[PDB]
């Protein structure tokens, strides 16, 4: 298992514009297009991302390409963030993939707001961090996915992902 397979499981793959769990227009592997209510704005953002007139539909390769770019950006966002970097560097490989998933889902900004959990993960207090991460809107809005990431931060193995 690796970060790409992990996020492919959590996000799914859809080739036509769709609405995510917060109702925002998305495509592919969890690639958010816009928070605007307009489908037309969504379609415009998609053509601009792909470089062609897609008419709201993309191919598998194109979805994979947006995915590679989004994973890369997530990593780089983490490495550039002063609150995130130290955590990420203190973690083992499996757990670093956990932090990339949260950032891919909720943004740098969002993850960096989990100050207390961050401090517990940096200290390697696994069960404590797991309990604090669950006290969040993230856990209450997407519990199945949050449970998989939290269990992975707790055990350091890929078991939750079968
Ligand atoms: Cl893009
Ligand atoms: Cl979920």
Say how many Å lie between the CA of residue 155 and the centre of ligand 1.
34
Ligand closest in space to the Cα of 147:
2
Question: What positions carry a catalytic annotation?
Answer: 11, 20
* Exp. method: X-ray
Tell me the CA–centroid distance for residue 100 and ligand 1, in Å. Answer: 18
What is the distance in A from the centroid of ligand 1 to the CA of 116? 32
Of residues 53, 51, 49, the one with CA closest to residue 27: 49
Confirm or deny that 38 is annotated as ligand binding. Answer: no
Resolution for the entry shown, Å: 1.8
Distance from the CA of 46 to the center of ligand 1, in angstroms? 8
32 known member of a binding site: yes
The overall longest dimension of the chain from CA atoms, in Å, is 49
Q: Identify the structural domains of the chain with CATH numbers, from first to last.
A: 1-162 (1.10.530.40)
| Least distant ligand from the CA of 50 | 1
| CA 73/CA 67 separation, integer angstroms | 10
């Amino acid at each position: 298992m690796n970060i790409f397979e992990m996020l492919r499981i959590d996000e799914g793959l859809r080739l036509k514009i769709y609405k995510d769990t917060e109702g925002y227009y998305t495509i592919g592997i969890g690639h958010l297009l816009t928070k605007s209510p307009s489908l037309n704005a969504a379609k415009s953002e998609l053509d601009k991302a792909i470089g062609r007139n897609t008419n709201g539909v993309i191919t598998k390769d194109e979805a994979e390409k947006l995915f590679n770019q989004d994973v890369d950006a997530a990593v780089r966002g983490i490495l550039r963030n002063a609150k995130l970097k130290p955590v990420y560097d203190s973690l083992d490989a499996v757990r670093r993939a956990c932090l990339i998933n949260m950032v891919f889902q909720m943004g740098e900004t969002g993850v960096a707001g989990f100050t207390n959990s961050l401090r517990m993960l940096q200290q390697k207090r696994w069960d404590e961090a797991a309990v604090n991460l669950a006290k969040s809107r993230w856990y209450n809005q997407t519990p199945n996915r949050a449970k998989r990431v939290i269990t992975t931060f707790r055990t350091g193995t890929w078991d939750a992902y079968k």
